[PDB]
Amino acid sequence: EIVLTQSPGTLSLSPGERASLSCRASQSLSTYLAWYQQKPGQAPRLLIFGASSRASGIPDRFSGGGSGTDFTLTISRLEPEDFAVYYCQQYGSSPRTFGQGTKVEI
C-alpha cells in the first residue's frame, strides 16, 4: 500500500493570501492523486483529481500540481471557509490509501 505522508501536521495562517500542503508517496503515483477537504463534523468534499484538475463547484482559489512522488495543493487567498482538514488520496495501486490529514488553523 503506497504510504501517503503529509509533511506539515498543522498549518497556521491568518485569513490573508497563502497556503501550501505537500503530499509525498513512497513510490511514484504519476499524477494519480486526489485532494479532498473535510470540514469538521461533515463529509469529505472532493477538490482536485488527477493532481492538477479541479472538480465541479470548487472555486479558482484551489490549485494543485505534482507528479511522481511529490504533490502540492495551494490556496490563492485563504478565505475563512477553507480552514478545515485536507486529505491526499492515491489511486495508482490497490487499495486507495489516504494520508494522515493536514489541518489548517488561524
Partner: peptide
C-alpha cells in the same frame, strides 16, 4: 504512458 513512470504503469 511516459518514460519517467514506474514499472507498474
Amino acid at each position: 504512458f511516459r518514460p519517467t513512470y514506474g514499472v507498474g504503469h
